[model samples]
Target: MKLEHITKKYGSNVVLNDIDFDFGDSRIVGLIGKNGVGKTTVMKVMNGNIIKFDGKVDIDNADNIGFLIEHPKLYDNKSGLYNLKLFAQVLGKGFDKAYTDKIIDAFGMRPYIKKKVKKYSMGMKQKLAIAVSLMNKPKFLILDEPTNGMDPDGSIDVLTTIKSLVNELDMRILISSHKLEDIELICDRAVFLRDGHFVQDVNMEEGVASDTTIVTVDHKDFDRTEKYLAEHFQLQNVDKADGHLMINAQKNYQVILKALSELDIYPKYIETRKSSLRDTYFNINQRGDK
Candidate 1:
């Protein structure tokens, strides 16, 4: 689906400016921004809920899209299975029982499918909500604040499940979250919204896959080695972290080693850590309170 130059306003105040984004298939995109930055407006547009807007949303089929925004709206008194059935009815025809059962197992909801929604743990409730959104077998899924109130284990549980679903179900998902670390855990790309526009799109997978080298030399050789390496290597950054010299560069492992070898300055071990979403996020010229 593609959101082409979309805009939304209320009276004289604009919530979403002319923005464009293309979401194809089989990838998870994390939307990151401060509160009231129009993330939900964009999502609402995608799901055809917020229709009073400018520009266009192009999609093959609207029924093939699903969303769970804010919190899961479950009937507290009803059983989980009942809630799924009720929502399926609301979704109308095309509620495939066998497919629903498949996702029920995929979401790990079978253990408590018959239990009342009120009795579920926070993680379980969220998982069921996600499954309900996806029951139509959508090609696209949208989740807003999916891990909002969960603890560490609960957050990990939901995130890992979302990641697995990308491969298992073969769907494209757009997620909005305040948690940068959570986004980094599962999303392939991250879109940063500022004011009413999408300010940046970062490739978290590519960045995380790129290695940053940590080279250590004796304190005596630190100054010389640092200068030599900086002068010789095609580095992104050569900075100090902990007791070692942190080097970020193209072909990091090979480049740094070759530079050090040229200087005949090998002492101590070398290690590497991947670039992070949190670090890349903060490094951007971000707006207030992100």
Candidate 2:
């Protein structure tokens, strides 16, 4: 799917501004941002839930698109099997007992398939939501906060199930979530948005090197350490935090250590912070603010 120059507004308050994105095939793309950064709006637009938006959205296999936003629409008083049957009928895909059973088994929902939806746990509800959306074999799946209100075990179950579906069916998925770790675990690429604009787009392959490396020096050697880093490395930002000189560099730790050693400067504590989608997201937003 391709979204070009997409812009959205609510009266005078713009929510998305001149954004462009191309969701490639057979990959999980994470749409992540802080609260109220228009992540949900973007998903809605992609699923054609939001109509009054600027620019074009061209989705490959448009007819085979399915989405679950915020919460699933399920009949609380009915059984899980009954709800699935109703949705199947509504989608014009008459309930096939074999297919329904397959989906239930895939999500490990068999134990509660006959239980009323109202009695299902948060995780079970999420699983049922995914199963219902995928009942017709959608090529593209859009999920917003798939693990919103679940416990740790539930979160793991949902994430694991989603990953399995991606690999087994080669389904193209776009998930929007505030949980960076979960996104990092499943998504092949991550797109960041801040204040209605596209801030950065990075894939997992480039994340390791692109991540900022933080170095801390004793306060006693702060000035000297700062000077050495300034002359030796392409420092992104330098500051003092927690009584230590914090250095942010984009190079490998070995190089930074070599430079420090050459300068005869020894850090009180040397830590190579593992790069993550969360770190990148914060770095982009922090830089943008300046």
Candidate 3:
């Protein structure tokens, strides 16, 4: 999908001002932002749900769109298998038992396949919702917080399914979620929004490297370590936060560690911490979203 000069407004507050972007086929992209930032509205506009937007969203076919929003409504009285069958029927492909079974098994829904929707757990319901959205394997899949109600294992399943769709089935996916780690793990690119406007559109493969590193020492040695580093090493940026001393050094972990070792103050644990999409998003927004 390609969006050119996309603009929307609510009263005086403008959302998505002159947004120009394109999403190519066979890629997984994550749309991330704080709440009420027009992420959902963008997806809705792409699906042609909102007709009031001033923009052009070019899609090859409207029928190729699949949307999974929050609060997926389903037939509570029917069994999970029956629900799948029903949706398949709506798509004019009646009861694709083989592919339906594969999806159910992939999501670990075999035990509840014959159970009524009312008896399913929230995560189970979410899995079923994802399975339903993917029933036809549309050209473009839009999922809003797809793993919102899942447990760790269930979340892995969802991620696995997403990867398989791209690698094997050749589908393009656009997801919006508050989970930054999930976005980082799966998406090739990220679109960040702030206050109903585009803040940054970043290429995940070329994100800026984080210069921050944190090293932890014994509780009793914390003060001496801090003092020694400050007085002798000339480590410019060092601070103690949340029981660890943070150092801002760019690709010099061994040098910092060696210096600490020379003072007989070895770190109990030292690890590099990179600036995440969440980090960049907040940093950009805090500067008035420039």
Candidate 4:
């Protein structure tokens, strides 16, 4: 599935602008951004919730798409099992008792499957909604904050079930969440949206890192190390703080360490500061402000 040149607006407020994205088989893509960045609106367009939008939403397999956005629309008067059966009937796929039971057990919904929808808790309702969406065994699943109102244990169970479905069924999934850790854990790639445009697409495995390396030396050797580094290497900055020398050099560590060893200046520690997705997100937004 792909969205090409997709644009949307409310009166004069343009919410999405020429967005292009693709989802392949058996992979998880994460849609991430700050609050009100139009993540939900983009998903809505793909799910056919919002029809009046500019650009083409090219989906090869439209019949096998399932979406659960914001909240689940279920009958309050019916039982969880009844709702699942009704949804299956509507989809023209007769409900299989063993399959339904398997889904329920996967989400830990067995205890409340027979209870009325009105009597179920928020977490239980979310589990049921997810189960209903998967009843037809969709090839593509769009989940917006799927673990919204669940406890830690419940969240774990929901995520585990989703991961299992993706691996076993070879399902393609697009998920949106504010939890960076959750996205990092499951998604292969993250697409960051800022304002109304796609800002950055990052691979989760190769994380962001600072260009400069930080080296710490003993208090007595701080001045000597700083002098040696400044004189030998093309340094951006060399400063002393907390009784340690912080050197930012153009050359790599191998050259600098060799030089230090020859000079008989043994440093205490050396480290490279790398940034995580959480840090990358904040840095991008902060730069945008300026």
Counting clashing residue pairs in each candidate, in order, gives 0, 0, 0, 0
Give residue 72's error in model 2 in angstroms: 2.4
CA deviation > 4 Å runs, candidate 1: 24-26, 89-98, 208-267, 271-275, 283-290
Question: What's the true lDDT of residue 30 in model 1?
Answer: 82
Of 2 and 3, the candidate ahead on lDDT is 2
Per-residue CA lDDT of model 1 for 4-79, tens digit only, reads 8877888888888878888643388888776676777777887788768678655665447778988788888889
lDDT of 4 by residue, 1-290 (tens): 67789878898999999888775333888888877777888888878888897787656655587789898889988788888888888873577887778778777778777888998778878888889899866778888888878777767767877899788777888888776776676678888899798889876444433545667677778767777867865455456665545444333467877888887878777776556678888888887676
C-alpha root-mean-square deviation, each candidate: 5.6, 7.3, 7.6, 7.0
Model 3 stretches astray by more than 4 angstroms: 24-26, 92-94, 209-273, 288-290
As a whole number from 0 to 100, the lDDT of residue 90 in candidate 4 is 84
Each prediction's TM-score against the native?
0.75, 0.73, 0.73, 0.75
Q: Where does candidate 4 stray beyond 4 Å?
A: 24-26, 61-63, 206-273, 288-290
lDDT score for candidate 4 against the true structure: 0.76
Say which prediction, candidate 3 or candidate 4, comes out ahead on lDDT: 4
Reference-based lDDT, each prediction: 0.73, 0.75, 0.73, 0.76
**How do the residues 1-290 of candidate 2 rate in per-residue lDDT, one tens digit apiece?**
67888887888999989988876543888887877777888888888888887787665544577789898888877787787777788763477777677667878878778888888777778878988888856777888888888776778777887888778776888888776776676668877788888787776554445446556676677787778767764565567766444445343467767776886777767654566776676777787576
The best candidate by lDDT is 4
Stretch of 10 with least lDDT, candidate 1: 234-243
- Candidate 3 TM-score versus the reference: 0.73
